[PDB]
Design a protein around this ligand. Structure first.
Ligand SMILES: Nc1nc2ncn(CCNC(CO)CO)c2c(=O)[nH]1
Ligand SMILES: [Mg+2]
Ligand SMILES: [Zn+2]
Length: 278
């Protein structure tokens, strides 16, 4: 797909169009775009004006790259992301992650809306991603497939420690300072292709494999991020309890859930920003 140079050119283009030099990158999922307000000294670029960038076609994804200061911390946010079901191969879905590494970003925060498989989860819950299950990877659909680019990372990167332990600990401390009634959930995220929603037999199956939440994104990004050395932290906004007995999922409802949790996710991410090291 892309050559090392391609990533370089896009990085140089961003560096020369804004004075902002982000240390952290945040990828906002479906209905999580609101995080971009409260960003101060913001600078926005539409994905379409940035050389080599893909386009967001899904409802709820603005398709804008936003630079700014969040809580005394310089960062860059993807208001909208890319999904495999849209038609993009993983090397396109993850293009932004390598660009961020080339800008000097050290930490990546991934976020998404997902279905809750763990029966103890409630709509509106926030689940820290402690680990993931990459179903597409089982069959070979992987962003690292093909010749390896030594300049980014190694041929066989390990994924067992993908989700930084210290940041997860910090997220737990930050949450207690918020005095929330609900406790911070934590679990395994499983990714499948989409775009259709799962059947009851599929959900039972996912749950029995040890999954706590299901979605159609994020995993490709974490993989590429770990491959090029970025520290990674992530969470799912539980948008609905999945049906396990023989209603029905719809995107509008997931977006609605995102609006309702806006105040909560915004303060949570703001506070969290003051806890990133380096
Ligand atoms: N039952 C269920 N609830 C969900 N909430 C979000 N997603 C992730 C899929 N996200 C799509 C449509 O919301 C847009 O990226 C899901 C899902 O796959 N299943
Ligand atoms: Mg400015
Ligand atoms: Zn210009």
């Amino acid at each position: 797909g892309y050559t090392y140079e391609d990533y370089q050119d896009t990085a140089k283009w961003l560096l020369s169009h804004t004075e902002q030099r982000p240390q952290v990158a945040v990828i906002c999922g479906s209905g999580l775009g609101g995080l971009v307000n409260k960003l101060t000294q913001a600078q926005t670029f539409d994905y379409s004006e940035i050389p080599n960038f893909p386009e967001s076609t899904v409802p709820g994804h603005a398709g804008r790259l936003v630079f700014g200061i969040l809580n005394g911390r310089a960062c860059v946010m993807m208001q909208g992301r890319f999904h495999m079901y849209e038609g993009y191969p993983f090397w396109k879905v993850t293009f932004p992650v390598r660009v961020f590494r080339l800008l000097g970003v050290e930490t990546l925060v991934v976020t998404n809306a997902a279905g809750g498989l763990n029966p103890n989860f409630e709509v509106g819950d926030i689940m820290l991603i402690r680990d993931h299950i990459n179903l597409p990877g089982f069959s070979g659909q992987n962003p690292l497939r093909g010749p390896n680019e030594e300049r980014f990372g190694v041929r066989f990167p390990a994924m067992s420690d993908a989700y930084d332990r210290d940041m997860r600990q910090k997220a737990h401390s930050t949450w207690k300072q918020m005095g929330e009634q609900r406790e911070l959930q934590e679990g395994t995220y499983v990714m499948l292709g989409g775009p259709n929603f799962e059947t009851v037999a599929e959900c039972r199956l996912l749950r029995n494999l040890g999954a706590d939440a299901v979605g159609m994104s994020t995993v490709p990004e974490v993989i590429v991020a770990r491959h090029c050395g970025l520290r990674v932290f992530g969470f799912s906004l539980i948008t609905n309890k999945v049906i396990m007995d023989t209603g029905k999922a719809n995107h509008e409802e997931v977006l609605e859930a995102g609006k309702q949790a806006a105040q909560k996710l915004e303060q949570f991410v703001s506070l969290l920003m003051a806890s990133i090291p380096v």
